[PDB]
Design an enzyme around this catalytic site. Structure first.
Site, PDB file in Angstrom:
ATOM      1  N   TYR A  14       0.806  -1.212   0.000  1.00 56.91           N
ATOM      2  CA  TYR A  14       0.000   0.000   0.000  1.00 56.91           C
ATOM      3  C   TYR A  14       0.847   1.273   0.000  1.00 56.91           C
ATOM      4  O   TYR A  14       0.599   2.181  -0.781  1.00 56.91           O
ATOM      5  CB  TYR A  14      -1.000  -0.003   1.160  1.00 56.91           C
ATOM      6  CG  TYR A  14      -1.677   1.328   1.359  1.00 56.91           C
ATOM      7  CD1 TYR A  14      -2.845   1.647   0.676  1.00 56.91           C
ATOM      8  CD2 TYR A  14      -1.143   2.275   2.219  1.00 56.91           C
ATOM      9  CE1 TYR A  14      -3.454   2.869   0.852  1.00 56.91           C
ATOM     10  CE2 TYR A  14      -1.749   3.498   2.401  1.00 56.91           C
ATOM     11  CZ  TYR A  14      -2.901   3.792   1.720  1.00 56.91           C
ATOM     12  OH  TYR A  14      -3.501   5.012   1.897  1.00 56.91           O
ATOM     13  N   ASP A  38     -10.087   9.247   7.243  1.00 59.84           N
ATOM     14  CA  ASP A  38      -8.804   9.891   7.033  1.00 59.84           C
ATOM     15  C   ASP A  38      -9.038  11.385   6.942  1.00 59.84           C
ATOM     16  O   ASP A  38      -9.529  11.871   5.906  1.00 59.84           O
ATOM     17  CB  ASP A  38      -8.208   9.355   5.721  1.00 59.84           C
ATOM     18  CG  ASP A  38      -6.839   9.917   5.411  1.00 59.84           C
ATOM     19  OD1 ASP A  38      -6.485  10.983   5.950  1.00 59.84           O
ATOM     20  OD2 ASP A  38      -6.112   9.287   4.611  1.00 59.84           O
ATOM     21  N   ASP A  97       3.154  13.205   9.054  1.00 55.05           N
ATOM     22  CA  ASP A  97       3.401  11.927   9.718  1.00 55.05           C
ATOM     23  C   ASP A  97       2.058  11.280  10.043  1.00 55.05           C
ATOM     24  O   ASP A  97       1.177  11.925  10.614  1.00 55.05           O
ATOM     25  CB  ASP A  97       4.187  12.147  11.006  1.00 55.05           C
ATOM     26  CG  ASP A  97       5.585  12.663  10.754  1.00 55.05           C
ATOM     27  OD1 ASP A  97       6.315  12.055   9.945  1.00 55.05           O
ATOM     28  OD2 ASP A  97       5.951  13.687  11.368  1.00 55.05           O
ATOM     29  N   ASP A 100      -1.406   4.448   9.859  1.00 58.52           N
ATOM     30  CA  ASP A 100      -2.565   3.770   9.311  1.00 58.52           C
ATOM     31  C   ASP A 100      -2.847   2.486  10.072  1.00 58.52           C
ATOM     32  O   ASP A 100      -1.942   1.688  10.324  1.00 58.52           O
ATOM     33  CB  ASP A 100      -2.338   3.412   7.845  1.00 58.52           C
ATOM     34  CG  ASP A 100      -2.697   4.528   6.887  1.00 58.52           C
ATOM     35  OD1 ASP A 100      -3.181   5.605   7.296  1.00 58.52           O
ATOM     36  OD2 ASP A 100      -2.494   4.299   5.672  1.00 58.52           O
TER      37      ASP A 100
END
Length: 124
Positions: A14, A38, A97, A100
């Site tokens: 990813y 997100d 920064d 995930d």
């Protein structure tokens, strides 16, 4: 669900896809009805079309770099978390920064993605 080693590979893959900015390949990594939060805290977006639009907006229109900044931490229940840095221009050179957290499905596709970051994590 994907094994811990498999999760590491998939989450690393990813990042590589984000780094080159291959929208269609990123979208294919997601389940067809996946959700993305997100930044985490915002309402989820649903489904590959919405996810494609999200990535087109965020990655398209300029060079973006992305590197893992530590190892992927995988579980034995098809989940993982990883730290990374995304470099972009907005709108000079800036870096974000991010961590995930992902949950994969029985087919090795991302079912849920949660990207932890806030403005404190941005640098011009």
């Amino acid at each position: 669900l994907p094994t811990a080693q498999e999760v590491q590979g998939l989450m690393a893959r990813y990042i590589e896809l984000v780094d080159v900015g291959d929208i269609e390949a990123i979208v294919q990594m997601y389940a067809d009805d996946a959700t993305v939060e997100d930044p985490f805290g915002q309402p989820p977006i649903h489904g590959r079309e919405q996810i494609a639009a999200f990535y087109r907006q965020g990655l398209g229109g300029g060079k973006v770099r992305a590197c893992l900044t530590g190892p992927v931490r995988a579980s034995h229940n098809g989940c993982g978390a990883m730290p990374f840095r995304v470099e972009m221009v907005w709108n000079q050179p800036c870096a974000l920064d991010v961590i995930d957290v992902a949950r994969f499905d029985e087919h090795g596709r991302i079912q849920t993605m949660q990207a932890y970051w806030s403005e404190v994590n941005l640098s011009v």
